[PDB]
Design a protein around this ligand. Structure first.
Ligand SMILES: [K+]
Ligand SMILES: [K+]
Lengths: 303, 300
């Protein structure tokens, strides 16, 4: 029997509520971090180079025993530039139940993991939010952050100012567009770096002590968003230690020590040092995509 | 933006002729065995167990440069259910989601035929099929098309299914009561059984015979005995895959002489006078070739 096909529009209609998405993501992160005691099977991503066209195909299968869900995300990146599809299988008989868009899931799931980390890691008296970058991830983060948290001031810097200005006028609340990374981050309590810089743009010397940084961009071993002082002096949280030590250049080039996985903090195995300067380095994980995709399918197929 | 969805019957409708499928498989096999200069990107398959339901998900992506095609095969083993995704290689765009079962059956049968044209002994008159499932039909269809046998024989663990086969099929098929009766005097043997312990013993095999060993796809299962695996000249589609997945190879300790692609390219000889086994595991680039044929035919 043919699978259902769920377009980007159909996916977004079944993922309007972050409050429905955050809890299973917290469960998934915690379970992943339990490893062999947690029921998640998430093998290393396989990437197949298509050199003749300057492209990559990535494949990210995952199974969650706890939710009883089997998925595979297939993503292509080409120098939209990122295109993703999520496959959802019936875990009891292997049948292919759905092929759905993966871009929306990725935007929403990444923003949601960042919010979870920020809930746990932001300092006392978190009044200022700063966003570095102005693309898809800046929008999805802005959406969930301004609804989950109460910020007095939201600031933005982008490599090209015109795009930050467009962002600012499009979006509902007030956002202060800044001339530099420096101006944007000075006095900021929470920082979101959703950028395509390959060399450090955020320097530890500008960071307010106790600030929390969700570092989302620079998902290659040679690419960095953050300097050595910031990566070495902050308490460093990640989603996956294995993935970070293979894929994150901020981690690898700085030589920084990983304190914990976010899932270890959710489960109580590791403390949330929200008083100290913190970096959450997000790479993304197949089980996060699994969680959102399951949530989309169960919603679509019933209500 | 939405991909095309091709059902099993649509795939079958666009894969009617094996003489269009065989030449690009030959090129793919040779290009895979040439290494990096052959342009084939084929990572080791990723397996995800779902122990709660005693099942597994398998994922096999591939890119071919010669063909300029990009696919991923997703198969659940629990009874194999396969899906093939085909992408626009210049784009990343998902062009099609198609059934993988028909492709699997057609591709495997075509690769056995290629092996058989290269490795069957001189004066090959007798064909023998062990097993009577999906793979037996697809093998029979292409083999009677590609070769002219004086006699075709079959055995299956349940005789009822062997006679049902012999009735459905166009041409005379000798149903045989034992494996031994079926293979003695056989020039070409196809093993596509559900056996997990050796059912074919070297003792019964005519010197020079060619065996296509398609069954026993797990490292703890076998169809053939030690004598056959060690005395035969052993060919495979992929050496890496056989040393990981093939119980007949591992439990015997047999040495692999050549990849089938090396024979096609001229890098290794076809020792067709000697008793030969071709151990077929299946490769992502083999499915990619079939999927590309299908999609281009459908698209036209
Ligand atoms: K903090
Ligand atoms: K032979």
């Amino acid at each position: 029997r043919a699978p259902a096909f769920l377009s980007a529009e159909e996916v977004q209609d079944h993922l309007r509520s972050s409050s429905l998405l955050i809890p299973p993501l917290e469960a998934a992160l915690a379970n992943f971090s339990k490893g062999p005691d947690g029921g998640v099977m998430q093998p290393v991503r396989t990437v197949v180079p298509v050199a003749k066209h300057r492209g990559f195909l990535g494949v990210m299968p995952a199974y969650s025993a706890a939710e009883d869900a089997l998925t595979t995300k297939l993503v292509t990146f080409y120098e939209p530039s990122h295109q993703a599809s999520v496959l959802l299988f019936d875990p009891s008989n292997g049948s292919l139940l759905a092929v759905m868009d993966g871009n929306v899931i990725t935007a929403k799931r990444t923003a949601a993991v960042s919010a979870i980390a920020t809930k746990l890691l932001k300092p006392p008296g978190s009044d200022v939010l700063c966003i570095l970058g102005a693309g898809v991830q800046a929008y999805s983060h802005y959406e969930i952050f301004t609804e989950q948290f109460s910020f007095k001031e939201v600031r933005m810097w982008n490599r090209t100012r015109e795009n930050a200005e467009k962002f600012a006028s499009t979006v509902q609340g007030d956002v202060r567009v800044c001339s530099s990374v420096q101006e944007a981050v000075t006095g900021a309590d929470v920082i979101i770096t959703v950028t395509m810089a390959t060399e450090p743009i955020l320097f530890g010397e500008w960071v307010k002590p106790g600030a929390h940084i969700n570092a989302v961009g620079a998902s290659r071993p040679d690419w960095r968003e953050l300097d050595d002082e910031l990566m070495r002096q902050a308490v460093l949280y990640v989603d996956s230690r294995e993935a970070a030590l293979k894929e994150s250049g901020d981690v690898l080039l700085s030589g920084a020590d990983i304190f914990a996985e976010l899932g270890e903090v959710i489960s109580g195995a590791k403390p949330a040092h929200c008083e100290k300067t913190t970096v959450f380095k997000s790479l993304g994980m197949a089980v996060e995509d699994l969680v959102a995709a399951k949530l989309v399918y169960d919603s679509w197929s019933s209500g």
